Design a protein around this ligand. Sequence first.
Ligand SMILES: CCCCCCCCCCCCC/C=C/[C@@H](O)[C@H](CO)NC(=O)CCCCCCCCCCCCCCC
Ligand SMILES: *[C@H]1C(=O)N(c2ccc(C(=O)NCc3ccc(Cl)cc3Cl)cc2)C(=O)[C@@H]1C
Ligand SMILES: *[C@H]1C(=O)N(c2ccc(C(=O)NCc3ccc(Cl)cc3Cl)cc2)C(=O)[C@@H]1C
Ligand SMILES: CCCCCCCCCCCCCCCC
Ligand SMILES: CCCCCCCCCCCCCCCC
Ligand SMILES: CCCCCCCCCCCCCCCC
Ligand SMILES: CCCCCCCCCC
Ligand SMILES: CCCCCCCCCC
Ligand SMILES: CCCCCCCCCC
Ligand SMILES: CCCCCCCCCC
Ligand SMILES: CCCCCCCCCC
Ligand SMILES: CCCCCCCCCC
Ligand SMILES: CCCCCCCCCC
Ligand SMILES: CCCCCCCCCC
Ligand SMILES: CCCCCCCCCC
Ligand SMILES: CCCCCCCCCC
Ligand SMILES: CCCCCCCCCC
Ligand SMILES: [K+]
Ligand SMILES: [K+]
Ligand SMILES: [K+]
Ligand SMILES: [K+]
Ligand SMILES: [K+]
Lengths: 271, 282
Amino acid sequence: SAINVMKWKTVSTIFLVVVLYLIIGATVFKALEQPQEISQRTTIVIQREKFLRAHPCVSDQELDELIQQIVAAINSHWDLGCSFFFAGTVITTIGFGNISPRTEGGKIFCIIYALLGIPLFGFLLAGVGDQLGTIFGKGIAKVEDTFIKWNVSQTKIRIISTIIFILFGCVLFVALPAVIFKHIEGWSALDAIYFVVITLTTIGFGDYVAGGSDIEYLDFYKPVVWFWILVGLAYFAAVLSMIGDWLRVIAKKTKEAVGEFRAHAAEWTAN
Amino acid sequence: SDSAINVMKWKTVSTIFLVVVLYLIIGATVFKALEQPQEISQRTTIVIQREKFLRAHPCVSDQELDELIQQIVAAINAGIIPLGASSNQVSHWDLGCSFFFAGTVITTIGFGNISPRTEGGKIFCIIYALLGIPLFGFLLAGVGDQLGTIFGKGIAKVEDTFIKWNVSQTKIRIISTIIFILFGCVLFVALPAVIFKHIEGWSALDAIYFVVITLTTIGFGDYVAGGSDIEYLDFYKPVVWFWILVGLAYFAAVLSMIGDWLRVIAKKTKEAVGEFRAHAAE
Ligand SMILES: CCCCCCCCCCCCC/C=C/[C@@H](O)[C@H](CO)NC(=O)CCCCCCCCCCCCCCC
Ligand SMILES: *[C@H]1C(=O)N(c2ccc(C(=O)NCc3ccc(Cl)cc3Cl)cc2)C(=O)[C@@H]1C
Ligand SMILES: *[C@H]1C(=O)N(c2ccc(C(=O)NCc3ccc(Cl)cc3Cl)cc2)C(=O)[C@@H]1C
Ligand SMILES: CCCCCCCCCCCCCCCC
Ligand SMILES: CCCCCCCCCCCCCCCC
Ligand SMILES: CCCCCCCCCCCCCCCC
Ligand SMILES: CCCCCCCCCC
Ligand SMILES: CCCCCCCCCC
Ligand SMILES: CCCCCCCCCC
Ligand SMILES: CCCCCCCCCC
Ligand SMILES: CCCCCCCCCC
Ligand SMILES: CCCCCCCCCC
Ligand SMILES: CCCCCCCCCC
Ligand SMILES: CCCCCCCCCC
Ligand SMILES: CCCCCCCCCC
Ligand SMILES: CCCCCCCCCC
Ligand SMILES: CCCCCCCCCC
Ligand SMILES: [K+]
Ligand SMILES: [K+]
Ligand SMILES: [K+]
Ligand SMILES: [K+]
Ligand SMILES: [K+]
């Protein structure tokens, strides 16, 4: 019973931290998106009135009619390339959602496909992460013999190892594919980085999709991006895990800072 | 970290890799078999609606028609409502909406119905994801632990009904797993589905579909609870928030045990291939 009370206090504090995090994020997102949302809000209503006046021969009541059936139409996209990419988007959980099942049977099969594919792909992702782990481990085990030379102690070397990991991982799984996407997809630099992060975190908004545009592309383009999806998902799993590990020590150092502070402040009211 | 096992591991993942490739290949061909027909059924009915007004309004440039379609669908990617009967739209980035969006990012569901457009929004979204996803992982771990300990006490109450009719061991563990999947499906999949059926006005299959697509954190965005311009019950979206929490915990557990079942199946297949190759044509 009492260990469950200690658990409830831990989970409660974590939950409230997450709520506060959402509150901060919400107010910040509003602060950035609303202003430029009006900048884009007037650009379409202007085109409305301006093309109703530039084409007076068109009925104003027939204007909204086309918008109805157009948004209804948003409600070939299904060649082997598209369905294969979609089968990738389900089992990786990267739910871009650009194309989705509309038939009832298609929805049922998508359910079964997800429930079986996500675990199997988890096994694959584990194997890839292990391969990368041993390949990077030999590199850090070779650079530790050239590091213990000019030095005295340790602990600093683990942090240098993590720094090397973050640097090479960022120049191989986020930077280089970003500049390639800049060129092939015609995206901007920040949009390329944005796409990399949103995809490799498995968030997958769908506002930026590599190989999804009406661009020529190469025979070895989308397959290479597939391979990048594999290794990048592994790398981002590791980096997210270790960011969580940093959060652990931060929580511990903050509760010990709180102890240090309350203990150094209680004796001041006494004096 | 060395030795010969790294070859033995490479054979494992490689075979799994080919399996997943095969798994994708099959998955690709079947989806096409269902979605492609109704895609052309609507693809030719709209090009008719195009041409029928392409001839009924020759006063239109028609080359500027699809041009207008360009800017309208591009603005729909930002979620526009260009109407005159309802010449007053609501903001997609108020506190209520932006809170839900910040929820969709840290859970990785990422519905994507509304997305950042400003430069700062994208940069902040990157930082926000990189810090939020692990923290929410801790929260999900705590909720999964709470559900696990409540289920442990629940099965600890029925253990007096086990030490009686045929005393076994593992066969009772499988019943435990059965109880887990059944009750979890009737509380985190079935009940919210019928609620979505009622409030959101979705169909039964669409409700189950939404539940599954969200609790797996896929999140296509074609179905969003509380995402329509409907009144709702003010105490609806918070309840769906709590459902998001407990459902993600439950689905993590269910996916993990599906993987374990796949493991046992894979071992039984590696033994079946041996039995067959050794028995060669009986
Ligand atoms: C950039 C983000 C920074 C976020 C990090 C700031 C810290 C906030 C997160 C703290 C969450 C608790 C973490 C672990 C808690 C205990 O399991 C831990 C076991 O190892 N025990 C203690 O620390 C020894 C003391 C035990 C503390 C119990 C948990 C805290 C409860 C304190 C308040 C009690 C009321 C709770 C209701 C809100
Ligand atoms: C139909 C459609 O969906 N695509 C299309 C086809 C192929 C890709 C693709 O493979 N992108 C690289 C890739 C691979 C796997 C994953 Cl999990 C993600 C990604 Cl980004 C993208 C889009 C089309 O060209 C039409 C629109
Ligand atoms: C603006 C917008 O984004 N929403 C909106 C507001 C709130 C919700 C919501 O909370 N749905 C339940 C929920 C909670 C958390 C998560 Cl991670 C997922 C879900 Cl489904 C949805 C949509 C609006 O009504 C306008 C369009
Ligand atoms: C041995 C690993 C090297 C890491 C780079 C290999 C490819 C990973 C992504 C780079 C290419 C992705 C963009 C697609 C270019 C055709
Ligand atoms: C080194 C392990 C290789 C995997 C052995 C074959 C596994 C194939 C059976 C499980 C794969 C998913 C099948 C789902 C329907 C039975
Ligand atoms: C829905 C996909 C079902 C696919 C079921 C069969 C695919 C995997 C079978 C591979 C069998 C390999 C035997 C391993 C021999 C060592
Ligand atoms: C372990 C289940 C929760 C125990 C405490 C219940 C009331 C606390 C929330 C108000
Ligand atoms: C997903 C379709 C893109 C074209 C081929 C990409 C790789 C095919 C085999 C992995
Ligand atoms: C009518 C809904 C049918 C859902 C079928 C689910 C099958 C799960 C197999 C793992
Ligand atoms: C990753 C989600 C599916 C978990 C089952 C796969 C087991 C190996 C991954 C840890
Ligand atoms: C981002 C602000 C979080 C503050 C942490 C409060 C918890 C204190 C632990 C004793
Ligand atoms: C406050 C929790 C729900 C967040 C969605 C915003 C709408 C609040 C009233 C339903
Ligand atoms: C406001 C645009 C200037 C460049 C982005 C600055 C904001 C970064 C997140 C606070
Ligand atoms: C080009 C700007 C890239 C955004 C900076 C990302 C920093 C991540 C810190 C967590
Ligand atoms: C994943 C569990 C799905 C529950 C089956 C739904 C059956 C509804 C019949 C009324
Ligand atoms: C819902 C479980 C599917 C596997 C993804 C888990 C998190 C992925 C990015 C952290
Ligand atoms: C340690 C390897 C266990 C067997 C490989 C994983 C099987 C994946 C599901 C078919
Ligand atoms: K998604
Ligand atoms: K999406
Ligand atoms: K979308
Ligand atoms: K996800
Ligand atoms: K997703």
